[PDB]
């Protein structure tokens, strides 16, 4: 029922609506993380509580591990779940808008004037 | 035909449908009353 020009436009809405939405979203870090220590005895006595000067809780949170001296809602977190899901169906819509486009491109390509043996090898004049 | 709509429009389209059903309802009731008379 729809033309190619329209579909190309609406996906391009979702792509940048995706880019903006993802930019707002915060994501936890997953990088690996290694410390260079001087000798074996300093290596063995190592403990994260000492190294950062943080408690066991602030060790677990790598993003905002506040030092100890520095230390010295369902509906809300429910809403955090959705925001991640609207960006998720912005993705799902985008791939679905992506999907219909090649079919529309393919039919136009098939309608194109050509040898169409599968396309026979032929230089176009 | 098929189109995908933004949030603001669908509220507009939802209401104008609500108007027309009420408008037909109010107009549809008036006719039998005068027809009954």
């Amino acid at each position: 029922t729809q033309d190619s020009n329209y579909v190309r436009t609406l996906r391009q809405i979702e792509l940048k609506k995706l880019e903006k939405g993802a930019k707002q979203l915060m994501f936890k870090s997953s990088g690996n993380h290694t410390i260079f220590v001087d000798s074996r005895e300093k290596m063995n006595e190592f403990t994260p509580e000492k190294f950062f000067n943080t408690t066991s809780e602030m060790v677990n949170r790598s993003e905002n591990r506040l030092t100890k001296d520095q230390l010295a809602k369902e509906s809300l977190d429910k809403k955090k779940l959705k925001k991640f899901k609207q960006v998720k169906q912005h993705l799902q819509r985008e791939t679905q808008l992506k999907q219909v486009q090649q079919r529309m491109d393919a039919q136009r390509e098939l309608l194109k004037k050509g040898s169409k043996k599968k396309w026979k090898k032929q230089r176009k004049r | 035909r098929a189109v995908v709509l933004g949030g603001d429009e669908k509220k507009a389209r939802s209401f104008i449908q609500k108007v027309l059903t009420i408008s037909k309802a109010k107009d549809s009731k008036r006719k039998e009353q005068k027809a009954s008379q």
Partner: peptide, 11 residues
């Protein structure tokens, strides 16, 4: 013309 229309990808 809105009747001619049908919505898709509802969100």
């Amino acid at each position: 013309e809105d009747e001619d229309e049908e919505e898709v990808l509802a969100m």
